[PDB]
Amino acid sequence: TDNTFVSGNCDVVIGIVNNTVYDPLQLELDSFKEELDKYFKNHTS
């Protein structure tokens, strides 16, 4: 998402191929959610 920009849906462009776009913020958010889950497990379980 840093070297790409979004403009509309993908029903207009002719020849648009369709592949995963990586988002670092979501990756670190998921990692921190996993860390919080581990902390909660250490708290109760």
Of the candidates 35, 4, 43, the residue with the CA atom closest to the CA atom of residue 21: 4
Least distance to its own copies from the beta carbon of 2, Å?
Answer: 9
| Residue written as token pair 């592949």 | 19
SS3 1: coil
- Of 13 and 40, which has the nearer Cβ to its own copies? 40
**Binding string, residues 1-40; x marks residues near its own copies by CB under 8 A:** ------------------------x--xx--xx--x--xx
- CA separation for the pair 37, 43 (Å, rounded): 10
> Which residues bind to its own copies, rule: CB under 8 A?
25, 28-29, 32-33, 36, 39-40, 43-44
